[PDB]
Amino acid sequence: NAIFSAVRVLATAYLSKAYMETVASTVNEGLAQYDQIAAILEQEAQIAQEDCHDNEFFLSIREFSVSVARVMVNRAYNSPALIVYSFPGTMHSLVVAWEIFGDAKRSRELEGRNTGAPWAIGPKVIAERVRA
Amino acid sequence: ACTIQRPEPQALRDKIATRFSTNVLGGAEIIPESNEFYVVTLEYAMQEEFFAFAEQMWREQDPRYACCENLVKMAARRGVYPKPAQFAQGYVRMTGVPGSALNQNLRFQFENQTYEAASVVPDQLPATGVLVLRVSAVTPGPSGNIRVTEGSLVTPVPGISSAVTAYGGNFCGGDDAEECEPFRTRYLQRLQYEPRLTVEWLKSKAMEWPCVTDVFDLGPNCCSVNALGEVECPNNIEFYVLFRDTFDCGLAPQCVVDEITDWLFGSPQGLGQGEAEFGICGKVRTATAVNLDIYLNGLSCATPAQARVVEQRITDFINRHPPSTNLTVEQLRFIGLQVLGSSFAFDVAIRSPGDASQSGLRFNACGDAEIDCDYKACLNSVQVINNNVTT
Amino acid sequence: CTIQRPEPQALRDKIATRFSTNVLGGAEIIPESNEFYVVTLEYAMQEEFFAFAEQMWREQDPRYACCENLVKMAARRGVYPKPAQFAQGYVRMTGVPGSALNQNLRFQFENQTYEAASVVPDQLPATGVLVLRVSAVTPGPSGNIRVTEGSLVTPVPGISSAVTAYGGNFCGGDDAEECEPFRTRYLQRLQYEPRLTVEWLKSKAMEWPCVTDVFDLGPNCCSVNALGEVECPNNIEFYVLFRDTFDCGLAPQCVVDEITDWLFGSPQGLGQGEAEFGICGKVRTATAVNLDIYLNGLSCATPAQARVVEQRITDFINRHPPSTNLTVEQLRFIGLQVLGSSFAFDVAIRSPGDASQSGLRFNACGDAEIDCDYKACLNSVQVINNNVTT
């Protein structure tokens, strides 16, 4: 069991390091990724504490999980700081980008976060927070 | 295995839920999905950590589980400390024309090992032109032990012969430091309950005599039974000692062990003039060598790496074998089989040199080499017979 | 590997992140809201737990436990403090033989009351002399006075009212221990283990009052070690001296008998005393043998050197172990060490009045041979001159 348990913990730790190198497409998706990891770390913690198999390992695993949460949650909610807008009706990606930001060249960003064809984005849009 | 009894998780989760309702919500239970439900669950999560913290900080206070740093701190409070590294030692004979002045920094070399004077050197060579010095290895560790009787001055000085010789013996006694795990077992042994610790105390003490390497208790073959068919327990104390780094096969002559016995027990014994307590009588023994030849069969099908290690393991096993103990084919077969694999075809046999008879050696039907009292199996040669396979 | 007590800031943040993520779904903790007070209260409970735990685990350490907690977890292992001790000494009394004695004697020496400590016989011995062991009535260092004459507190028919103390020696007084000196000698005892080595038994004897030296049986004694049908030595015996109290440091048999009973127990061989189970022994005294020493030639040395030689020789013989030869060479060496190797020195040993004394003989070389239970005692050292120089 030592081989299996050690491998799984190492893989999860490096997987988290991989998620930190990419931008969160959406807050809902960003948090979904975190839940996928917290379960694995929590699952490992119970096994290592079933019958005091390794108390020190249980403490270390628990401390790591909260550390992961502090960063994963921050990335989802504050990496680009997305927000939902409420437009009066569907409009093109180019027009939407110009209105919100004032630069039509930024319509590229809206592609990955909003479903729908490029000519029917809306009526509610997800974009960044203007910080003029 | 837990030392802090932890009630069943269901029993705990009810207790927290009941306490929360009685104090905050006024007797009503929790809604399945609400802030009250989650705070309760989080409280349970922190509950587990407190149990672990309490248990962990108990484990860090027990000798058989504490950390290495903490272990030494506790040991220091009961007069037990780890053994530091040792330096080799010995005597050196120096010859030169009388009158020539000497130097303190002078040093020697014996087979790539450099030794330095370990005592205040006199001002100049004495009248007879012969001088004796005490030397210690420049660097610690077991590498300072060697069996040689000629050296050579490394820093020439006028009027002193360019050749230097040691005493009839040799330099030894150096050893490496003590690790953590060997220290832990030693400390635990002291704390435990052991009957007849006087025997243990003497055995440990005898290891401090120079040139000693191992201490072995009386072997199983040394048991004796009187004519009444009842096992006999003596009131004396005896055991074996080996000098694997000084004598051929580690067996020393009788005259050497006689000196140790007098120092340990006194002269006459039992009066407490020696290291032993009052009213203690004993004797330190030696052993005689019986040669053996070992033949490994069916090892050609294995890769060269496997053959090399298997030969090495068997050689070490025979070398460290205690005196007055049987040597069985099963032991050697098991050791090699543990490396090759349980399904391998491995067989070993034991025979005497020239198939001649020796004193204290007897072969049984199964092929074991039974050995009498005061006799140790000394390896003579290891031969791996040759055949052809896999072509 | 090691996990230790977390710091405050590193601990509060851990709770806030855990509380926020698992309850508020990642929402930030707005200060002064209800969650702010909940989080800080949770941290308080977290910290108070560690502080108390560290506080209690200190008391289990003898190096730092308070005094009242040190007496326990020390009496459990059989290590108690020490109260004020009692001074002790020896007394002598004489009277009409056959007079009835009492077990409630009391002696007043000088503002101090001493009570009999041994068992007083029913009647005075035939010789009319009795020696007792007495202890002070008030414990403390004040009982170590040095007076030589005292009087019986209450008169007794047929017994004189004047008594004397051998050498006016009184020793053993002391004061009670304190907490700090007690903490040591306890955590020091943790690192010790007795072994019955002959040094231990020899040391134990000196604890008896007014004992100065202790020696093994000398070369001229053929000891017995079996004392039974056993294969290993079983018996131990040795001498004692009272240099500061008795003449020549030799005590009557009435005293050494008491020491033997206490040290080896009574009955013997059953470990009833301070000795191991199944070990028997005996403590014995010796009878004095007087000697006279004639130093020849010292009169021509400076007065300062003459006194030194006389003083050194007297001291050496006083400390001489019982039942051991007193060779001439030992005396001569003392003279050469101070007078110089080129001096014309000579010594000789003769008995007082050139008489015969039991247990004394002179060998060819001129030394003195002494048998068992006998000791060499200096009687008088004189200087003679029978040569010419200067």
Short description:
The structure is cut from a larger assembly and holds 1 copy of chain A (132 residues) and 2 copies of chain B. Chain A is mainly alpha-helical. Chain A has helices at residues 2-19, 27-48, 55-78, 93-101, 107-113, and strands at residues 83-86, 124-127.
What structural class do the secondary elements of chain A suggest?
A: mainly alpha
Q: What would you call the structural class of chain B?
A: alpha+beta
Rg of chain B, please? 32 Å
User: Order of strands across the widest beta sheet of chain B?
Assistant: 2-3-4-1-6-5
Percent helix of chain B: 25-40%
Description:
It is classed as virus. The structure is cut from a larger assembly and holds one copy of chain A (132 residues) and two copies of chain B. Chain A has helices at 2-19, 27-48, 55-78, 93-101, 107-113, and strands at residues 83-86, 124-127. With 132 residues, chain A is mainly α. In chain A, helix 4 packs across helix 5 (107-113). Chain B is α+β, with helices and mostly antiparallel strands. Chain B has eight helices and 14 strands. In chain B, the strands form four sheets. In chain B, strands 2-3-4-1-6-5 form a six-stranded antiparallel sheet, with no helix packed on it. In chain B, strands 7-8-9 form a three-stranded mixed sheet. In chain B, helix 1 (9-25) packs across helix 2 (35-59). The interface between B and C is medium-sized, with 30 and 28 residues.
